[model samples]
Target: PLKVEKFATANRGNGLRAVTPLRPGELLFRSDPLAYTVCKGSRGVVCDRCLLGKEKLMRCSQCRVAKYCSAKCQKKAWPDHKRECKCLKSCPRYPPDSVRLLGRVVFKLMDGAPSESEKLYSFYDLESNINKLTEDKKEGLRQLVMTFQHFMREEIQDASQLPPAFDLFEAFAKVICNSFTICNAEMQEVGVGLYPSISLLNHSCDPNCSIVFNGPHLLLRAVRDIEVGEELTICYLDMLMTSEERRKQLRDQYCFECDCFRCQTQDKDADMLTGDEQVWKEVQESLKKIEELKAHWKWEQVLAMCQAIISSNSERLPDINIYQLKVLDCAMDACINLGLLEEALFYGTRTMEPYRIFFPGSHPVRGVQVMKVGKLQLHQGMFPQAMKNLRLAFDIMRVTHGREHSLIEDLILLLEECDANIRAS
Candidate 1:
């Protein structure tokens, strides 16, 4: 396991750093939600307990608000649901996910010690970037705080329950601004959560790690080999954007200009802005060859095809575009599933560039790619590189499923063996 420590970076303020060499495909960190609400978009459609898409659900009789796919989910959610039910029932109108989750956060902080208390502490530790926000954004947050207060007054009905020093609005502001959007296996934005440790990771255009969500939990897994003492960074925006747009998004939302390697380079950060009909045709034809080659079990052909596609069209369409991502997708599977380890790693490595920006960091598809790349690295007799991908793959699993999930256990066995070999070497 990699030790996660917070140290001050010279110019980056406070950032999360790996105190030990973290293997790739390993979980660098795991966190549960401090507060989460089913996004309004997912309400009434996803399972109340598992967040699965469901229509065959029986509503909780008391509140008639949440619907569960089965009695199992219903019973499991009872403790928290019971409290939420009471709060919701007390109010005349339906409280949206924001109000609901905010209320939950408030009550949990007020409640006595238990796991919820641990979550409360985590909630307390996140940053708001209050002073950094533009005045307009700050005003918007102020309005949000008042909205939460109104909901609190109507639902809780007890002033004594509010913490004495608690600035409810300010805390609410922090939670809102710092919260991460929780996406499922399919990359749908299903909920929101606050992971304190994750909040400590700084943003880098050339980030070495990626994040994926499992229901209410978050898994921070490395996207590349992260050496000891290197800061763990996650890009704060869609990576498909050129470097300039990426920086703009960060400044507009987080109010910081990026100086990361990606931002400082003579890269395709602006070149791909202009699209060409001719190059797009080449991308499509290559994409077809990727499937055709894979269907025929032609690993070398697949690699060559993907390489040719990149050579001809990457300059025009760039790897970050949807077209390039699909080609990489086929190339990654063809190389690995066909037993072409080095070939898979070659294309797989290329795939990560845009996949990091285009795919949801938490998606199963992305996690599996990291695993293949690691396995490929292992086969190539590269222990140092192999370990990173192997651990990152397991980290995604640990967050998606528990550590005991069968696939996770399998990964653990591999990690144990790899750790032994690495340590002895």
Candidate 2:
């Protein structure tokens, strides 16, 4: 329920701006996706239909391509799945997410773009990047195009082929290449989504806004307070990535150099976690091992390894290093997953300190971590303490997310519950 101003810029093409001052935790804007596809990796791990959290699910009757949480989701998805089902059943292999997602978009276009108030959604406005691609690059992308052709041939009966006027393969590839990664609360990739309004956002290594998802919808919030007329921006990629890495990704994929304030520094060794050269090298090796454990969902191993890394490198790294904070976060998550709430709270509460020290009073990172602290306190039945942190969290979140948003809705409930518990005692 927030309003934003859009204008054309000389260097950035078009960008979003705040029409009024937005404090930290205040809503910036929100919108749903034009198209979305569950990442193949997340298929069994999440509900195949909406990609929502699922404890259990029902397998597809025809193909083991996916499972849904309930009959409603399964039946609702039949029209789309019906197309892919036959293909998956007889085929020797499952298609990659890129092909499946492109197939979804093609079938959606065949259905025609959905509309609000009779005005059709326009994907035509999306940057195809086909024009800038070298002929060699164009040739490389045809693999996905071939997959698209194969999938469509088996899946859809409506369109035999796409028109020759369009660079059909390149168009779909660009769409996939430029699409936003949809992530869960833990910053895990759950799916891919296309938001028309979000595509308006320009890339920045150090952006003032953050992107969070509530299902297929994107919730944009101010990571920092923005004065009136300031550009509204979000990082297209991880802010933790090194300058050279970020620059290469942006240039290779989106085809632009990032001259954002952070990139301008080019020496954000502080953020990129290049603290002590020796410690950095050590953490690097430890982190790679930790990453492998995480990939395999080895919570107990990760938990112990995290402690080992922190313990071994205790004196070597700075107290508030980003590298240290990340592993701490990993420890927190690992404990929660391993049913170690006592340990989770210890690490989770500890994780809040770095954000508090490094970020401004109203920064969203601090706000979110404070919410974690509140949640941990609540889990420990410390009502008064929970109320205190939850109230502070509500204050910050109400600004980042509108009062009506679900994040605030849940926060409000927690605040009231903690208050009630305190009053009862």
Candidate 3:
């Protein structure tokens, strides 16, 4: 059999399943690009010789990387050349081996050169130092970071295997090792790293899981119980929004507006809660208070502020507004720190469901949440539940990310261990 098997989750209600139990912190999968080609357009922007931008006119003799408007441009660029030129000379003609690792993800190009797909997809935009966001945004991002940290703490036993190189590949590998992106369709590039296995899960407004990455490995885990034979799903967009923002992102990225249960009902209710003229003043005032609290790093105050708003405008304000999700995440983080696993999982689950409504099922964010729950289950020694969650996650990943994604490899490794443990039991 293919080292992995596929199935569906009963409770999830969409997407396929990769029915395999997974342990925490296992190597899911590792992959390189299938093929890469340079963007024909980038040739004009990048120096043909050094693969750097051309300050002066320069052109390439053989392929586009060589920039030389005149022989002088080629001559000026040549001193910095010999090594790259020699490498480029041996490089493949059609598909370049010049791949870059932005953050922890690998992006393949036509010939180690930029291509139209890369430009259009703009994979580089997602890369960041991880310390750049504002305090509130950073706090929000910390929940995301902690999920990976917990996964690593539970899944990886030895750190000796980590590579010591400091080159581009090594940097990419380190980012993937420490953090990973929720691979979304917006990040896809031709001949870049494609995970065939993780691409099988279909998109849904409300997904059952989240997608996460640890280096190149794509990890998926379920945030809810997937009954037997139910389609596992992961949301492809961010769910923290009013209906309009949610629909706009979905239509722009997934090409379809969401009409999911949560979007159709809860969203309208939320809109009415914020839209009513009588309530609007109070809601706006409360929103400002919450924003101020968030700015001050008083997450508890923020939660209280939101709760007060919810209580005062129960008729107008819904229980779980967009701010509620952020508040919940903040609370969940506190709960986790306090070792209140059940509470943390509860809030985490709540935060996750709405995420499904915002993103497509195959969105990497959903897979990330699923993996978070799986990690929680693993930490609690609930192997069967963990297996179920992890398997669902893997299935969703197969659709959003490809099977070849590094995260999938990590999931596979964990699943094998879980399977062995289950069999022994």
Separately for all candidates shown, the number of backbone clashes (residues 3 or more apart, or on different chains) is 15, 4, 91
For residues 162-182, what per-residue lDDT tens digits would candidate 3 score against the true structure? 223223422332232122222
Candidate 1 C-alpha lDDT tens digits along 206-285: 56777776666677776666688888888776544567667667776676887766678835544444356577667766
**Candidate structures ordered by lDDT, highest first:** 2, 1, 3
Work out the TM-score per prediction.
Answer: 0.65, 0.83, 0.37
- What would the per-residue lDDT of candidate 2 be over residues 106-214, giving only the tens digit for each residue? 5555554563211212455566676677677677678767766666566654444442244567667567545888866554568886676667677766678877776
Better-scoring candidate (TM-score), 2 or 3: 2
TM-score-best of 1 and 3: 1
In angstroms, give how far residue 239 of model 3 lies from its true place: 3.0
TM-score of 1: 0.65
Tell me the TM-score of model 2.
Answer: 0.83
C-alpha RMSD by candidate, in order: 9.9, 3.7, 18.4
Candidate 1 regions exceeding 4 Å error are 90-96, 112-121, 157-159, 276-425
Model 1 poorest ten-residue lDDT run? 112-121
For model 3, where is the 10-residue window of minimal lDDT?
A: 183-192
